[PDB]
Amino acid sequence: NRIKLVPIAPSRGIIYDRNGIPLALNRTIYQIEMMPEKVDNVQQTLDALRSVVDLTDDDIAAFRKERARSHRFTSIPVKTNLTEVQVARFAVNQYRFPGVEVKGYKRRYYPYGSALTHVIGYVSKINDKDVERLNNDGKLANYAATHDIGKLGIERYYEDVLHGQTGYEEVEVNNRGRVIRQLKEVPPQAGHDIYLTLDLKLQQYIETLLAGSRAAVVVTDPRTGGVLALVSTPSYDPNLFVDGISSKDYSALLNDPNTPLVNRATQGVYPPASTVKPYVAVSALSAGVITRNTTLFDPGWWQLPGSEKRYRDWKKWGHGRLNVTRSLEESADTFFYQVAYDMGIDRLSEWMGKFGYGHYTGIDLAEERSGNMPTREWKQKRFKKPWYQGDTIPVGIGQGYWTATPIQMSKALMILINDGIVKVPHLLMSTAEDGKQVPWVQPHEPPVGDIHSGYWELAKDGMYGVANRPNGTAHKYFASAPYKIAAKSGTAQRDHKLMTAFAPYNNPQVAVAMILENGGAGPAVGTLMRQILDHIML
Ligand SMILES: *C(=O)N1C[C@H](NOS(=O)(=O)O)C(c2cnco2)=C[C@H]1CN
Numbered sequence: 001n002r003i004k005l006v007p008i009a010p011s012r013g014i015i016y017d018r019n020g021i022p023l024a025l026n027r028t029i030y031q032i033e034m035m036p037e038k039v040d041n042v043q044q045t046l047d048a049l050r051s052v053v054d055l056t057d058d059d060i061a062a063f064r065k066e067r068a069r070s071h072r073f074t075s076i077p078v079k080t081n082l083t084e085v086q087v088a089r090f091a092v093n094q095y096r097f098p099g100v101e102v103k104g105y106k107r108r109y110y111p112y113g114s115a116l117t118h119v120i121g122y123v124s125k126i127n128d129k130d131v132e133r134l135n136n137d138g139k140l141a142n143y144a145a146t147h148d149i150g151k152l153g154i155e156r157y158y159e160d161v162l163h164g165q166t167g168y169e170e171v172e173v174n175n176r177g178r179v180i181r182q183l184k185e186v187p188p189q190a191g192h193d194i195y196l197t198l199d200l201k202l203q204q205y206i207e208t209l210l211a212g213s214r215a216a217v218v219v220t221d222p223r224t225g226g227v228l229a230l231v232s233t234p235s236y237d238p239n240l241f242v243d244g245i246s247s248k249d250y251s252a253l254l255n256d257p258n259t260p261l262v263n264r265a266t267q268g269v270y271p272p273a274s275t276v277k278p279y280v281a282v283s284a285l286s287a288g289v290i291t292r293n294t295t296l297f298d299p300g301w302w303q304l305p306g307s308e309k310r311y312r313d314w315k316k317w318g319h320g321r322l323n324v325t326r327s328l329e330e331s332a333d334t335f336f337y338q339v340a341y342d343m344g345i346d347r348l349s350e351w352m353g354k355f356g357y358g359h360y361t362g363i364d365l366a367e368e369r370s371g372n373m374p375t376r377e378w379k380q381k382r383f384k385k386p387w388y389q390g391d392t393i394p395v396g397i398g399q400g401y402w403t404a405t406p407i408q409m410s411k412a413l414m415i416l417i418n419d420g421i422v423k424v425p426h427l428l429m430s431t432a433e434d435g436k437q438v439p440w441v442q443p444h445e446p447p448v449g450d451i452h453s454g455y456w457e458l459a460k461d462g463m464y465g466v467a468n469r470p471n472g473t474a475h476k477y478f479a480s481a482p483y484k485i486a487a488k489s490g491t492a493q494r495d496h497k498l499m500t501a502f503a504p505y506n507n508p509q510v511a512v513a514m515i516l517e518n519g520g521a522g523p524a525v526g527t528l529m530r531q532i533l534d535h536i537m538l
Contacts, residue, residue, distance in 0.1 A: 002173050003183060009145035010164025011106060013191030015120060015154060017200040018228075018429060023120055024155065026106040030082040032090060033075045036067060038176055039099035046078070049100070052093045053079050053086045075101070098178055108148070108155075108242045114235035115204045118263040119227075119365070119427065121153020122238035124245070142166050151241070152263075154196065154427060157366050161431055164191035193432040197226030205535055206231045209528050213520035216264035218410040218425070219532065222502065222511045225414060225423030225442070227363070230407075232264035266361075266368040266407045270515060273490030274331045275500050276352070276398035278459040279412055281324050283351035284339045285455040292458055295323050298334040304341070304390055311337050311393050328462025331473050331489065333397045340396025345387055348395060349375045354448045355412040357404055362424035362443065371408060374401035398490060409513035413500050417508050419456040420448040463488050464505050474499075477526035483537050489526065494518040497525040503533050510536050 015024040032053060036042050046063070049055040059079050067076050078100065082090070090102050108123045110116065126149050134140040143149075144166055150156035167188030172181040206217050210233040219229040234256070240249055253261055262268065284290040298318035301310045313319070313333045319326065327335035340348060353359060358373025372378070374395065376387045394400030407425055414423050422445040431438045449455070463486035465471075467478035478485040484505035490498040497519045502511040512532060516525045523531075 001175075001180075002177075004171050004173050006169050006171055007144035008167035008169060008185070008188045009106070009147075010166055010188035011190035012108065012123070012164065013162040013433065014193045015162075016193065016195050017198045017203075018196065018226075019200070020195075021200050023110070023112060023116055023196070023198075023200065025109045025111065027109045028104045029080075029107050030087045030102060030104050031077050031080040032082065032100055032102050033077045034100045035073060035075050037073060038178060045097055045100060048096065049078065052089050052097075053082060055079050099176075110238045110242075112200060112204065113237050113239065115200075115207045115231075116198075117153070117235045117238050118232045118265065118367070119153050119198065119203075119230045120238065121150055121155035122241045123148045123150050123155050124241040148242075152367055153365060154194065157364050158194055158428070162191040162194060165189035190433065193435070195429045195432065196427045197221070197224070197228060197429050198230070198427060199228045202536065203229045203231060206532060207233065207235065209531060210516075210520075211522055213522065214258055214264065214517035215515065215520060216268050216406040217512065217514040217532070218265050218406050219536075220410050220414060220425055220511050222414045222417040222423070222508050225411075225425050226429065227425055227427045228510070230265050230427070232262065232268070234258050234260040236260045263365070263367045264406070264515075264517075266363065266365055266405055268405055268515070268517075269369050269371050269403045270405075270496055270498070271399050271402060271492040272357075272404040272409060273398040273492045273496075273498060274333075275409060275488050275490040275498050275513075276357075276402070276404075276412075277328055277331065277336055278416055278463055278488055279352065279355045280336055280339060280348070280396060280398075281328060281459045281462070282416065282449065282455045283348065283355075284343060285324070285458065286449045286453065287343060287347055287351065289342045289347075290324060290339060292325070293323060295321055296335060296338055298322050298332060300334070302334045302337040302393075304393060307390065309390055324458065325462050325465065326471070328459065328488070329465035329469055329472050331466070336396040337393050338396075340392050340394075341389070343392075343396075345374070345376060345392045345395065348392065349373050352402075355415055356408055356422075357402070357412065359408075361405075361407050361411045362426070362445075363407055364426050364428050364440075368407070369405055371403040371405055372401060399492070406513045406515055409498075409500060410511060413502065413511050413513055415448055416456060416459060417502055417511055419451050421451070422447060460486055460505075463502075467501070474526055477524075477530045478533075481530065481533065481537075483533075485530075485533060487526075487529065499525040499529045501529050501533060503537055 063078050130149050150159040167186050169185040170183040171179050174180050206229050215233045217231045220227050300313045300318035303310050319332045322332050322335045352373050360370050379387050395402050411425050428440040466474045467485040467487040474487045485503045486505045487501035498515045500513050502508040
């Protein structure tokens with residue numbers, strides 16, 4: 001009688017929000033299954049089971065379909081998703097069905113559904129590319145009894161800690177290879193529990209605000225860089241994937257022209273437009289290219305020296321006399337055309353790279369694009385044509401070759417709030433079990449520029465003016481707030497509508513970057529931003 005070792009799948013760790021609310025859970029699902037070879041009389045067994053587990057003709061059909069499409073010596077499911085009653089009836093009848101096994105399988109469950117799709121992700125069935133990745137990473141031995149895996153979001157990025165440590169048992173088997181005893185059991189170790197910075201209530205509020213728009217919202221706490229909300233719409237039900245998604249349902253997602261499978265907050269790549277002007281300003285001041293008193297007269301346009309090409313301001317006849325304060329308040333373009341010209345692409349791109357543009361943010365998700373912060377060498381490589389001075393101008397107002405993700409915008413916004421201190425935007429607060437609580441630790445990232453210069457306050461005061469002063473572009477949305485809001489909007493390329501904001505002005509507790517593709521399906525981005533800041537601050 002052979003003694004056999006058999007792996008035991010560990011329990012997947014639990015994901016909680018910042019208030020201990022479970023966002024991803026496990027449910028046991030029971031089924032009976034058999035290896036037909038090990039069953040003396042398959043047909044006798046199948047029919048006796050109609051009485052015991054309510055096995056149906058359809059069940060037998062699916063069992064036969066599955067029997068063929070399977071390899072020799074495979075345990076074929078006979079009936080799935082057994083009810084409590086049905087398992088009990090099978091249990092008291094088990095001695096009658098040697099070769100039929102009743103088994104419980106943990107499957108993942110997402111109670112809050114589409115509100116958390118992109119950021120939490122889902123686990124679904126392992127496929128061959130997962131196997132490849134596990135084999136290459138040297139992790140495959142630990143998956144001997146594991147058949148599902150995180151595919152995106154937190155479930156994927158933290159797959160290794162969520163999964164746990166496979167256990168095993170020694171079991172005696174007789175001739176025909178049926179289990180008659182368990183000799184020994186080394187139990188698995190459950191995955192670590194994971195505690196996220198997210199605020200579930202805030203996340204669900206934002207999803208409802210974004211309604212039928214293609215949109216992204218990133219809410220962070222600038223004191224920590226923790227992500228309080230990361231929403232991309234339209235979304236979809238992650239639960240669809242857990243038990244294998246229908247072809248009908250999955251093609252429906254792929255064919256949606258509103259591309260709900262895209263995480264727009266980390267993979268949406270847009271011209272950041274005027275939202276960059278606070279950071280360009282800080283750069284120009286720090287580089288000495290401008291001063292708080294630098295002034296030019298704006299006729300509504302700006303001409304490139306030694307050329308006839310003109311770059312227009314959004315305001316037809318100009319803003320008149322502009323310093324940097326008033327240029328931020330009114331989102332003047334002309335001023336920043338000049339600033340770009342005087343900076344040159346080398347300095348401007350170098351500074352914007354310090355703000356994180358063009359680079360990955362370091363967020364703990366694996367779905368992410370880096371965008372593009374253009375440089376001489378990049379245009380040389382990408383088109384094999386050199387950089388002309390006219391390529392620098394549009395970059396000053398966040399356009400040209402410049403593209404960014406909303407999560408990059410959030411990381412830059414926080415750097416301005418922290419006076420050059422760089423905080424990675426992250427979702428992980430801590431990891432638990434035993435536990436043995438391990439806090440997320442900020443990787444060493446040198447600061448930007450000089451903590452002590454008053455350039456940060458100057459740019460931020462301009463953003464305060466955007467929101468509060470009567471000439472500010474966002475006055476209509478924010479001036480009436482009790483707490484003080486500072487903001488900066490933008491419009492890209494109907495056009496995309498971007499908004500960035502933080503509150504309260506004095507000691508910021510929340511930072512928001514958001515965009516409604518093509519202006520959204522409902523309210524304006526400024527109204528939505530005020531609603532989010534109102535919901536948070538009350
Ligand atoms: C930046 O993206 N700007 C300048 C300005 N931004 O303001 S807003 O559209 O976000 O409100 C702008 C504008 C103001 N009024 C009409 O357009 C457009 C865009 C021009 N580069």
